[PDB]
Amino acid sequence: KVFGRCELAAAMKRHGLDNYRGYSLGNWVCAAKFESNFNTQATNRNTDGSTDYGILQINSRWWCNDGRTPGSRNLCNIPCSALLSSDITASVNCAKKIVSDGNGMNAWVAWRNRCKGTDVQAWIRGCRL
Numbered sequence: 001k002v003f004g005r006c007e008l009a010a011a012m013k014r015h016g017l018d019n020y021r022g023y024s025l026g027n028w029v030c031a032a033k034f035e036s037n038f039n040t041q042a043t044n045r046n047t048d049g050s051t052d053y054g055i056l057q058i059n060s061r062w063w064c065n066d067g068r069t070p071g072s073r074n075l076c077n078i079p080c081s082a083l084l085s086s087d088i089t090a091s092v093n094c095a096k097k098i099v100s101d102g103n104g105m106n107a108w109v110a111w112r113n114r115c116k117g118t119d120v121q122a123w124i125r126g127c128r129l
């Protein structure tokens with residue numbers, strides 16, 4: 001599924017991400033736009049052989065199992081394919097574990113480079129939330 005901006009904002013709000021660990025909703029929307037262009041089916045392979053999955057580009061070295069990333073952990077306890085669902089529940093629940101790990105949203109490279117320090121409230125402007 002390819003979300004619209006407000007539709008995704010609403011779904012993230014319903015699943016408890018607004019101000020989760022102090023990150024306002026626009027941060028989460030901005031990270032999804034630049035990680036996946038709001039496409040739940042997005043995959044991208046990394047140099048190390050790990051792959052990133054879904055709307056928040058969660059990495060199989062640490063967080064999920066894809067059966068092809070040797071020595072990797074599965075800290076969210078889920079197959080990586082779960083992260084590609086039209087239902088964002090599994091992505092959200094894993095993202096909450098990631099953002100709790102010590103480095104906050106700096107775990108997401110696109111957030112650090114494209115969202116951090118910007119007017120992220122713009123990403124939710126206009127939406128009925």
Ligand SMILES: [Cl-]
Pocket residue numbers: 024025026027120121124
């Ligand atoms: Cl915001």
Ligand SMILES: [Cl-]
Pocket residue numbers: 060061062063064065066069072073074
């Ligand atoms: Cl893994």
Ligand SMILES: [Cl-]
Pocket residue numbers: 021103104105
């Ligand atoms: Cl933080």
